[PDB]
Amino acid sequence: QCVNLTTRTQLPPAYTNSFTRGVYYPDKVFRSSVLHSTQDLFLPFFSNVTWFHAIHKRFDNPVLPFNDGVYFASTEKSNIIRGWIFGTTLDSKTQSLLIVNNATNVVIKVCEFQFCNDPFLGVYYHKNNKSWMESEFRVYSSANNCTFEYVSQPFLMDLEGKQGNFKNLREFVFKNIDGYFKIYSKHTPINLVRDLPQGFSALEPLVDLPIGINITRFQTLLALSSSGWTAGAAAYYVGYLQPRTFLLKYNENGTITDAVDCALDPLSETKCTLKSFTVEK
Amino acid sequence: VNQNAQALNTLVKQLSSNFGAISSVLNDILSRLDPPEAEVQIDRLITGRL
Amino acid sequence: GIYQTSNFRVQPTESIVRFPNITNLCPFGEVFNATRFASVYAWNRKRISNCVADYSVLYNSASFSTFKCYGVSPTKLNDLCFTNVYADSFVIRGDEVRQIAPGQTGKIADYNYKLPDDFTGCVIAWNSNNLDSKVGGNYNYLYRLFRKSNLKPFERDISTEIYQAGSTPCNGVEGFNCYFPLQSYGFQPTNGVGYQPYRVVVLSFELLHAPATVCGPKKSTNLVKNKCVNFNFNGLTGTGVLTESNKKFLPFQQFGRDIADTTDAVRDPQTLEILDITPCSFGGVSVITPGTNTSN
Numbered sequence: 001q002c003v004n005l006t007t008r009t010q011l012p013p014a015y016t017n018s019f020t021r022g023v024y025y026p027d028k029v030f031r032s033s034v035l036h037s038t039q040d041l042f043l044p045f046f047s048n049v050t051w052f053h054a055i056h057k058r059f060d061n062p063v064l065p066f067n068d069g070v071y072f073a074s075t076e077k078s079n080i081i082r083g084w085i086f087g088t089t090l091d092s093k094t095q096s097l098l099i100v101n102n103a104t105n106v107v108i109k110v111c112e113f114q115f116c117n118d119p120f121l122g123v124y125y126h127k128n129n130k131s132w133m134e135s136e137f138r139v140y141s142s143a144n145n146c147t148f149e150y151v152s153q154p155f156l157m158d159l160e161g162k163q164g165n166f167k168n169l170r171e172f173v174f175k176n177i178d179g180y181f182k183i184y185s186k187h188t189p190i191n192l193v194r195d196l197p198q199g200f201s202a203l204e205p206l207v208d209l210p211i212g213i214n215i216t217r218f219q220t221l222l223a224l225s226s227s228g229w230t231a232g233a234a235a236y237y238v239g240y241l242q243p244r245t246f247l248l249k250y251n252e253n254g255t256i257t258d259a260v261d262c263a264l265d266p267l268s269e270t271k272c273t274l275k276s277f278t279v280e281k
Numbered sequence: 282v283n284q285n286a287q288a289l290n291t292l293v294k295q296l297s298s299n300f301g302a303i304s305s306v307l308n309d310i311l312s313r314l315d316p317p318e319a320e321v322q323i324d325r326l327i328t329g330r331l
Numbered sequence: 332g333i334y335q336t337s338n339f340r341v342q343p344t345e346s347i348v349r350f351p352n353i354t355n356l357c358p359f360g361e362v363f364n365a366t367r368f369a370s371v372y373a374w375n376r377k378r379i380s381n382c383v384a385d386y387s388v389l390y391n392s393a394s395f396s397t398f399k400c401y402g403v404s405p406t407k408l409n410d411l412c413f414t415n416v417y418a419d420s421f422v423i424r425g426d427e428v429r430q431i432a433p434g435q436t437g438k439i440a441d442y443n444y445k446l447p448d449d450f451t452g453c454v455i456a457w458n459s460n461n462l463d464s465k466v467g468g469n470y471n472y473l474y475r476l477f478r479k480s481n482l483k484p485f486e487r488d489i490s491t492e493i494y495q496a497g498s499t500p501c502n503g504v505e506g507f508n509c510y511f512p513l514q515s516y517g518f519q520p521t522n523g524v525g526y527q528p529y530r531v532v533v534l535s536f537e538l539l540h541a542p543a544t545v546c547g548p549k550k551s552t553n554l555v556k557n558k559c560v561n562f563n564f565n566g567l568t569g570t571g572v573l574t575e576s577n578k579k580f581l582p583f584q585q586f587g588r589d590i591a592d593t594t595d596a597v598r599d600p601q602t603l604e605i606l607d608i609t610p611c612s613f614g615g616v617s618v619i620t621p622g623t624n625t626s627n
């Protein structure tokens with residue numbers, strides 16, 4: 001089961017600026033009140049992030065690459081973003097990873113899946129019972145051989161909410177190195193309308209998995225007879241990581257408070273070679 | 282004042298280099314290898330620090 | 332005058348050991364006593380974690396024709412703790428085991444199974460002629476001959492692709508010098524030594540850089556504070572004075588390091604609390620004397 005939904009507007013890609021977002025904790029070693037120079041895969045400052053949006057109309061879930069990492073972000077209401085596929089063929093000859101934060105569970109699977117063109121989950125709408133209920137799980141039709149598996153504890157997330165401006169700000173960083181899949185994440189409330197917030201905040205690690213698959217493509221699974229539907233107001237942003245040295249500042253609490261992108265321009269480079277955040281004439 | 286502090290600082294940081302050994306911590310070389318092989322490693326550490 | 336002489340140092344009083352709560356043993360039987368080993372070009376990999384290993388019984392057995400370790404000593408494994416362990420199993424000819432060590436080249440090292448140069452692990456092999464080699468010859472053990480180029484450590488390729496050692500491209504299945512790269516061994520019992528089938532297992536455990544899961548059997552003692560003691564936290568050895576701390580380790584953190592790369596805080600592996608580490612006292616010793624011509 002899955003349907004080809006097509007009723008929606010067509011638009012060109014939109015680009016935006018990633019001011020100072022996408023910095024995380026590179027290791028599990030405590031450090032406090034110190035400046036430490038670290039080399040790793042970060043999202044460069046003042047970079048060009050792609051913008052996709054599902055509003056009222058607009059529903060675009062295209063195949064996007066996965067090269068050397070991904071900084072995903074979502075400004076959202078009503079918990080519409082829920083799922084992620086990852087794979088290299090997506091077509092039944094190689095294993096693929098699935099993450100689903102569905103209404104009841106948090107499911108993680110590494111299976112020999114077979115998806116179709118328009119995989120998605122969907123909840124009906126306010127049919128006089130004061131609740132939106134999951135009725136749509138048309139993602140895959142075949143599952144042959146699946147090694148890892150995990151179902152977390154059961155729960156129930158919200159499926160309602162009406163406001164003109166989003167307040168849910170989710171950041172995620174996804175990495176796949178040494179056959180290990182690493183997920184860093186962070187939640188924040190902000191008063192934003194249609195763009196990316198301006199500020200600074202670090203991403204605590206959330207998960208490691210010893211998966212060991214080869215990923216080159218991914219695709220979001222968004223929340224919605226065969227056509228005609230309503231979109232939750234939501235925008236989501238994509239950027240790509242690169243190998244770039246940083247200079248990180250830990251305060252008394254060992255809390256990363258500032259970073260210097262050490263090849264952005266000459267002034268930043270001199271700050272690195274002196275190991276300070278202030279330079280004198 | 283500054284010059285003295287700086288010199289002393291770099292002296293302290295040179296304790297975290299390998300100089301070609303397997304590790305910069307002496308107790309990991311002792312608690313991982315047996316003597317006849319641990320000597321070949323401890324020797325590089327000694328040369329660098331001296 | 333006043334002359335400087337030997338230094339002094341407070342000496343440790345006693346020793347401490349803290350280890351996790353692991354009870355179940357490791358599935359070594361599932362590896363060394365398996366019915367069936369895969370071919371070299373499709374070697375099998377099993378992941379061992381969350382148990383209490385005992386490498387002594389492996390080392391004390393005489394069944395093993397070669398038991399060589401490359402980054403550790405086989406005696407010490409029993410008091411080291413690891414984050415994860417890997418077991419690679421396959422079967423090879425009796426004389427190619429020499430090529431499996433790190434850094435060398437040859438047929439296998441170039442086409443089938445490459446070990447990194449900074450390898451830390453142990454290689455085990457023993458001849459299993461009678462168990463799998465038969466008078467007819469269990470010829471499903473087949474290895475690759477020709478490849479596009481050398482493959483990097485811990486790589487693997489499974490394919491039916493045909494190779495063209497010749498200059499001209501070759502299509503279909505076969506042709507002139509169009510070779511099927513896989514070739515079967517000549518394993519049968521009356522064959523002499525050096526062509527017998529040997530079984531090989533490789534352990535590629537990791538070291539002392541993350542929360543550990545596999546420890547040896549060392550039982551934990553109590554905890555003592557405010558005294559020079561010798562501590563051993565999950566293979567982290569040292570000497571000093573333990574203390575109650577105020578540093579607020581976040582849940583994913585486990586250590587605290589110094590500018591000279593020395594741990595100065597730690598988290599107890601059983602009761603999850605944060606302890607400061609401070610080294611014992613030291614200093615010089617000066618002797619003040621009038622001349623010996625005046626008094627002693």
Ligand SMILES: *[C@@H]1O[C@H](CO)[C@@H](O)[C@H](O)[C@H]1NC(C)=O
Nearest residue numbers: 351352353551600601602603
């Ligand atoms: C470890 O075992 C001891 C019993 O010896 C128990 O008191 C303690 O709570 C256990 N800790 C964990 C983390 O299981």
